[PDB]
Amino acid sequence: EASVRYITYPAIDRGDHAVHCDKAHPNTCKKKQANPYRRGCGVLEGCHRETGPKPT
After folding, report:
1. Distance (Å, rounded) from C-alpha 51 to C-alpha 16?
2. CA-CA-CA-CA dihedral for 50, 53, 54, 56, to nearest 10
3. How crowded is the C-beta side of 6, counted as CA atoms within 13 Å?
4. Opening angle at CA 23, ends 19 and 26, nearest 5
5. Rounded to an integer, what distance in angstroms lies between the CA atom of residue 36 and that of residue 56?
6. Distance (Å, rounded) from C-alpha 35 to C-alpha 31?
7. Which residues are connected by disulfide bridges in this protein?
């Protein structure tokens, strides 16, 4: 028999290992990416980040 079936849920265009880059839109193509929203820390107080409240 060797029966086999696969199913993939819908997605915009998120890859994993690698994706083909468009010759017309190669600047959109990225090997790796993160969330589209960006934010920088400009408080100048010190700005510190921790893994969690109680990583210990």
Report:
1. 25
2. 10
3. 1
4. 55
5. 32
6. 14
7. 21-29, 41-47
- Degrees, nearest 5: CA angle 31-34-44: 130
Looking up tokens 């849920």 gives 9
Contact residues for 20 (Cβ-Cβ < 8 A; gap 6+): 29
Q: Considering only CA atoms, give the Rg of the chain.
A: 20
**Whole-Å CA distances, 55 to 1, 3, 39, 49, 51:** 51, 47, 25, 12, 7
- Contacts for 13 with CB less than 8 Å, ≥ 6 apart: 19
| Deposited experimental method | NMR
Identify the DSSP state of 52.
-
